[PDB]
Amino acid sequence: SLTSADKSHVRSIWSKAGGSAEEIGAEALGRMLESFPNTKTYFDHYADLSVSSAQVHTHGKKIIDALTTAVNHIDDITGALSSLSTLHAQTLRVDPANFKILSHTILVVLALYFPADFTPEVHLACDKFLANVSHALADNYR
């Protein structure tokens, strides 16, 4: 579970980044698609998978906004994300092995854009937080 110190660290880095939701989310999504190309089949309906893609921008903002909501309901990530879990499991049919991939590219992007804020302990906190988010999104799969 996230400790109080973890949640402070997550709220801190997210407060610093949430204003760039679209840019951050497009970088993270874009990077998932290019660095882990087995993910591209999920977004094969988009004409452009690049960071400048308007569809990648729109969807990237959705991802970061959903995480912001989780950060604001950090004591119950399960309830915040259970609807999205159903969606990814039943409608989108996303293999849940992919959740850690987007979690990783999110961390990369946070490092890239806020290197002084993303200290080792903040990374730890943010890694626990995205594992919790991923565990939550995986919960309805079986």
Partner 1 sequence: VKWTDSERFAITTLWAKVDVERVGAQALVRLLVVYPWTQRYFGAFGNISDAAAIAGNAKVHAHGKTVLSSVGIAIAHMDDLAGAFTALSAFHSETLHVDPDNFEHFGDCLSIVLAATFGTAYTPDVHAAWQKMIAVIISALSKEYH
Complex with a copy of itself: residue 11 or 135, whichever CB lies closer: 135
**124 lies in the binding site for a copy of itself (CB under 8 A):** yes
- Least separation, in Å, of the C-beta of 116 and a copy of itself? 23
Give the one residue of 30, 70, 81, 129 binding partner 1; rule: CB under 8 A.
30
The conformation of residue 91, written as its DSSP 8-state character, comes to I
Maximum separation of any 2 CA atoms in the chain, in Å: 43
48 binds partner 1 (CB under 8 A): no
Part in contact with a copy of itself (CB under 8 A); list of ranges 67-75, 83-91, 114-122, 134-142: 134-142
Q: Cβ of 46: how many Cβ atoms within 10 Å?
A: 17
Candidate ranges 11-19, 60-68, 70-78, 96-104; the one touching partner 1 (CB under 8 A): 96-104
Nearer to a copy of itself, 97 or 124 (CB): 124
Under rule CB under 8 A, which residues in 51-70 are in contact with partner 1?
A: 51
Binding residues with a copy of itself: total (CB under 8 A):
6
Q: Which residue has the tokens 């989780």?
A: 70
**Contact call for residue 76 and partner 1 (CB under 8 A):** no
Q: Do residues 48 and 55 lie in contact, with contact meaning Cβ atoms separated by under 8 Å?
A: yes
Q: Which residues contact 17 (CB under 8 A, 6 or more apart)?
A: 24, 110, 113, 114
Written as six digits, the tokens of 113 are 């854009």
